[PDB]
Structure 1
Amino acid sequence: DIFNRDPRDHYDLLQRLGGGTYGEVFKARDKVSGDLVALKMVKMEPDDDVSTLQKEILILKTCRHANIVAYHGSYLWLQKLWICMEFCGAGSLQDIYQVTGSLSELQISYVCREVLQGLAYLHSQKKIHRDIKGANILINDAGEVRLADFAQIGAELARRLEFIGTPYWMAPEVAAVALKGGYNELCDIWSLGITAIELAELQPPLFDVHPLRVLFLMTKSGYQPPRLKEKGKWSAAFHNFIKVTLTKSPKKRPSATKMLSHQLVSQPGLNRGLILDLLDKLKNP
């Protein structure tokens, strides 16, 4: 039920949390109670279909999972869609590791297991996250791990159609690849393996190499998937987790459900207490 009210009548915007081409995300406060929410402001276009928006917003509402940022309703006011979500007080793992430094292997194991639970849920609903990275993994003050449920409207769709070009002369099989864009559900599994190296080393592999060079090497017959830099620092289970998630061929890359049975994320002692320790380090180094 997309409310046709201005969210600024119920919420005070307190802080710009992030943003990009799509719009902005804010920390907001209920003017009456004082509860904290995250409000995602998405710029609509005049050509965007309301039917598609109602379909996406209805499925978003019924897509309940503990590792997915909670949906609290949405507002549609003056060409702007505002999605109201649960606020995660610590921000992203990128926000955290930029102060705390690299995460321990047990902390990464817990993060990976929670992300894999969220990914198994999305993939069961025929969804693809498409952007697994430290910046997109949220942590609340309880040490819990959340992914946000998402690009197919407004300025992000306008920009993607500008990359694709005019479609009038495109054969249908070219149009189909331009819609999909290489994304398949197993691309989130590769992205999680890169994110695990990112949490361990504060950068993804090849961060200092020019993006075109990276893209080129990736598309060459015989590309070597990246690995952890310090071998001795990490267990054999962590090296193997990176090895199987970074399987080059998507036909051989394990699914999220299969990855949930891997030794690294199946081990005992993986709980939010590991992240409460990380959050303590954030307060006082």
Structure 2
Amino acid sequence: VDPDIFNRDPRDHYDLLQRLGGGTYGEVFKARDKVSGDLVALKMVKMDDVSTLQKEILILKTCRHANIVAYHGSYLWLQKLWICMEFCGAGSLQDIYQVTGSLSELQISYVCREVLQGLAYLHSQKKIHRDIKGANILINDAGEVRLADFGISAQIGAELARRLEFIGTPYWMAPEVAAVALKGGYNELCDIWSLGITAIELAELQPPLFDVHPLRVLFLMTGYQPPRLKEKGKWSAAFHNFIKVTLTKSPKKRPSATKMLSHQLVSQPGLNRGLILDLLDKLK
């Protein structure tokens, strides 16, 4: 729900062209603007506590950065909410590497730079993505990089707000319990770790431990040694160092997104959309 919501059928302004797939929740459709012919992405969510959707919309609406999917408005019609966003012609990095195979170090370097620019902006607004992965990093026809799917971020923000509201009397509560109730058990630096895992996923086609049961992975991480790239000789010492510092086990010692932007791997002068246009030609 939103004060700027369009209380109208989205088919008044758009032609639905094809179903693309789901996100954390909702189904995304490729649509075409009836007036300009411009393509958009429409995420349809069936409708309940509307708190998560209100937060998702607020997150998208208050973002004005090139590395974050552009938000064009939402429609409420027949108990379906449609969130209209920027369309990304090549899909996610996962749609691409599943066909093309491993990305080169330069292509990964450019993607990490673009994601870090988007993360530095999000963290500057006190926002946390919490779901950084290849499937949530979209590529348009121009080789440009966009962060998408704030569903997890919205669920966490709504859950935190719902928790403070029903926490009751805190007079017997221990300080560590009061701290988790107000700020959760972590901060925005979790996004820097997820980006390092994503760099390994782009290089190896899977995140570390993918073949291990999700619950067993949670227990292993909770003596845990941060993952490393498999083939040392395939990558430069700069890429190995990038993985090392992004995957700093202690968040306190983990560098911020702005600090990571001056790391040699992502501050190289030859990084641009042309590296991704090369990958898209390989997909063709």
For Structure 1 versus Structure 2, the TM-score category normalised by the shorter chain is 0.7 to 0.9
Deviation of the 1:78 alpha carbon: 2.9
The CA distance in 2 between the partners of 1:11 and 1:282, in whole Å, is 29
Aligned to 1:121: 121
Contact 1:23 1:42 in 2 (8 A): yes
The CA distance in 2 between the partners of 1:181 and 1:7, in whole Å, is 37
Deviation of the 1:30 alpha carbon: 2.1
Deviation of the 1:163 alpha carbon: 16
**Structure 1 residue ranges, 4+ long, deviating more than 4 angstroms after superposition:** 48-56, 153-176, 178-181
| Greater CA drift, 195-204 or 21-30 | 21-30
Deviation of the 1:236 alpha carbon: 0.4
Deviation of the 1:228 alpha carbon: 0.0
Deviation of the 1:19 alpha carbon: 1.1
Matched, 1:249 2:250: yes
Deviation of the 1:251 alpha carbon: 0.7
| Greater CA drift, 162-171 or 88-97 | 162-171
Deviation of the 1:61 alpha carbon: 2.7
SS in 2 for 1:165: coil
Matched, 1:173 2:176: yes
Go from structure 1 to structure 2 and tell me whether the alpha carbon gap of 1:78 and 1:8 turns closer, same or farther (over 3 Å shift): same
| Greater CA drift, 159-168 or 143-152 | 159-168
SS in 1 for 2:233: coil
Count residues with an aligned counterpart: 278
Deviation of the 1:80 alpha carbon: 2.4
Deviation of the 1:72 alpha carbon: 1.0
The CA distance in 2 between the partners of 1:68 and 1:22, in whole Å, is 19
Normalised TM-score (structure 1):
0.85
Deviation of the 1:153 alpha carbon: 9.9
Go from structure 1 to structure 2 and tell me whether the alpha carbon gap of 1:9 and 1:172 turns closer, same or farther (over 3 Å shift): farther
Go from structure 1 to structure 2 and tell me whether the alpha carbon gap of 1:161 and 1:103 turns closer, same or farther (over 3 Å shift): farther
Task: Indicate the percent of aligned positions where both proteins have the same amino acid.
Answer: 100
Go from structure 1 to structure 2 and tell me whether the alpha carbon gap of 1:164 and 1:89 turns closer, same or farther (over 3 Å shift): farther
Contact 1:137 1:145 in 2 (8 A): yes
SS in 1 for 2:164: helix
Deviation of the 1:55 alpha carbon: 7.2
Go from structure 1 to structure 2 and tell me whether the alpha carbon gap of 1:212 and 1:60 turns closer, same or farther (over 3 Å shift): closer
The CA distance in 1 between the partners of 2:70 and 2:32, in whole Å, is 16
SS in 2 for 1:232: helix
The CA distance in 2 between the partners of 1:105 and 1:164, in whole Å, is 48
Contact 1:43 1:155 in 2 (8 A): no
Aligned to 1:218: 221
Deviation of the 1:157 alpha carbon: 10
Deviation of the 1:34 alpha carbon: 2.3
Go from structure 1 to structure 2 and tell me whether the alpha carbon gap of 1:113 and 1:140 turns closer, same or farther (over 3 Å shift): same
Contact 2:60 2:70 in 1 (8 A): no
SS in 1 for 2:186: coil
Go from structure 1 to structure 2 and tell me whether the alpha carbon gap of 1:166 and 1:197 turns closer, same or farther (over 3 Å shift): farther
1:92-126 deviation line (CA, Å, top 9, x unaligned) = 00000000000000000000000000000000010
| Greater CA drift, 84-93 or 5-14 | 5-14
1:172-226 deviation line (CA, Å, top 9, x unaligned) = 965874786545200110000000000000000111122222111111xx21000
| Greater CA drift, 201-210 or 118-127 | 201-210
Question: RMSD of the TM alignment (CA)?
Answer: 3.8
Aligned to 1:267: 268
Contact 2:105 2:239 in 1 (8 A): yes
Contact 2:163 2:181 in 1 (8 A): no
| Greater CA drift, 155-164 or 83-92 | 155-164
Go from structure 1 to structure 2 and tell me whether the alpha carbon gap of 1:120 and 1:104 turns closer, same or farther (over 3 Å shift): same
Q: Any stretches of 5+ residues in structure 1 without a counterpart? A: none
SS in 1 for 2:181: helix
| Greater CA drift, 122-131 or 183-192 | 183-192
Contact 1:69 1:146 in 2 (8 A): yes
SS in 2 for 1:152: helix
Aligned to 1:236: 237
| Greater CA drift, 35-44 or 274-283 | 35-44
Go from structure 1 to structure 2 and tell me whether the alpha carbon gap of 1:239 and 1:52 turns closer, same or farther (over 3 Å shift): closer
Go from structure 1 to structure 2 and tell me whether the alpha carbon gap of 1:168 and 1:26 turns closer, same or farther (over 3 Å shift): farther
Deviation of the 1:70 alpha carbon: 0.7
The CA distance in 2 between the partners of 1:16 and 1:175, in whole Å, is 44
Q: Any stretches of 5+ residues in structure 2 without a counterpart? A: none
Go from structure 1 to structure 2 and tell me whether the alpha carbon gap of 1:75 and 1:156 turns closer, same or farther (over 3 Å shift): farther
The CA distance in 2 between the partners of 1:263 and 1:176, in whole Å, is 36
